[PDB]
Every structure is written in structure tokens, then in C-alpha cells.
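Ticket #4471: complex job returned nothing on first submit. Input attached below:
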Amino acid sequence: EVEALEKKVAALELKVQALEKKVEALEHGWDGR
Amino acid sequence: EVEALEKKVAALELKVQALEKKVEALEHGWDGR
Amino acid sequence: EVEALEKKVAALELKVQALEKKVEALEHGWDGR
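Support reply: We reran it on our side without changes. The output follows.
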């Protein structure tokens, strides 16, 4: 159970990181995004 | 503990999914969003 | 392991909350954002 939850948490961390990059681009207007 | 963490991770997965939909709409301009 | 995963899940919850605030500001146009 713990090892499987470790994987789900890691997948969440990667998705959050990707969302953070997109939102920062939107709010700062990076490269005209 | 594990069962409670399973619930918190599931709630995170749903919130991330909802954020992903909103951000994709913003960056692609879906339906004029 | 469980205590460390509790911390990673809490960090995710805070990052998701912060993303939610930013995305809602972008989609509603709060304060001209």
C-alpha cells in the first residue's frame, strides 16, 4: 500500500509542477502566452 | 492512517484534474475562455 | 514512511490551494488579472 501511494503522490507532484509552470506563464505573459 | 491518506490523495487527484481542465481552457482559449 | 508521506501530501495540498487561487483569478479576471 505505501509503495503504491508513494507512486500516486509522485504523479501528483509532477502534475502540480506542470500546472505551476503553465499558470506562471499565463499570469506573467511569458512568450506572449 | 493509510486509508485516510488514500482519501487525501484521491481528493488531490480530483482537484488536480479540475485545475488541468481549467488551465487547458485558458491556454487554448476554449469557448472564448 | 507514513509520516513522511503525510508531509508530501500536505505540501501538495498547499500547492493545489495556491494554484486554485491563481486560476480562479485568471478565469474571473480578479483585480484585472
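Residues 2-28 of chain A form one domain. Closing as resolved unless it happens again.
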